[PDB]
Amino acid sequence: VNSFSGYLKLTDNVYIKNADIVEEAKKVKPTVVVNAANVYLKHGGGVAGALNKATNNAMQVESDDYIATNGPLKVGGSCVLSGHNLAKHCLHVVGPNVNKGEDIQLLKSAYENFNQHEVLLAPLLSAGIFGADPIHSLRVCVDTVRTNVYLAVFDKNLYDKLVSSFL
Numbered sequence: 001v002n003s004f005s006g007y008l009k010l011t012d013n014v015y016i017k018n019a020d021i022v023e024e025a026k027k028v029k030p031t032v033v034v035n036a037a038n039v040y041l042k043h044g045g046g047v048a049g050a051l052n053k054a055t056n057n058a059m060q061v062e063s064d065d066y067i068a069t070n071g072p073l074k075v076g077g078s079c080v081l082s083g084h085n086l087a088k089h090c091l092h093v094v095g096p097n098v099n100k101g102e103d104i105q106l107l108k109s110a111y112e113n114f115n116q117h118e119v120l121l122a123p124l125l126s127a128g129i130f131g132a133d134p135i136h137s138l139r140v141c142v143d144t145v146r147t148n149v150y151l152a153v154f155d156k157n158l159y160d161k162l163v164s165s166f167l
C-alpha cells in the first residue's frame with residue numbers, strides 16, 4: 001500500500017490522475033518526483049519551472065552546480081538530485097523536445113530511467129511545451145515502465161481524452 005489517492009488504474013503498474021504535480025508532490029512527499037528536464041537543467045516553465053518555483057529556486061541552484069561539475073545530460077537521460085520540499089529525490093528526465101527537432105524514438109529511452117525506481121510521481125514525458133503527442137507519450141510509458149508510476153496530467157481535456165482513448 002502507498003499514499004497516492006484518487007488515481008485511475010490503467011494497467012498493473014500505471015496510474016493516472018488530473019492533478020497539479022506540484023500540489024500532488026507537496027501532499028504526498030513521494031520518494032521520487034520526476035521533472036520534465038532539459039539537458040541544461042534550466043527549469044523555466046511547465047513542470048520544471050513550476051517544480052523549481054515551488055522549491056523557491058533551490059532546485060535551480062542545485063542544478064547549476066550539477067551542470068558546472070558534470071556538463072549537460074543526454075536527451076533520453078536523467079540524473080537524481082534532491083527533491084527539496086517536494087519529495088525525497090527528484091529524477092530529472094530529459095524527453096525529446098519536438099520544438100527543437102529531437103528524435104521521438106528517444107522518448108522510450110527517457111521512460112527507461114523510471115525503471116531504476118520502484119515508485120514515482122511523474123508527468124507525461126515530452127508532453128506540454130516539449131511538443132509531443134501526450135496520447136503517444138502515455139502509450140510509450142505503459143509499454144516501457146515496469147515500476148509503479150503515478151502520472152499527473154495538468155490539462156483536464158487531455159486527462160479526459162487520455163482516459164477515453166486508452167487502449
Ligand SMILES: O=C(O)COc1c(Cl)cccc1Cl
Binds near residue numbers: 123155
Ligand atoms: O496536460 C499535460 O500534462 C500536458 O499537456 C498540456 C499542458 Cl501541460 C497544458 C495544456 C494543454 C496540454 Cl495538452
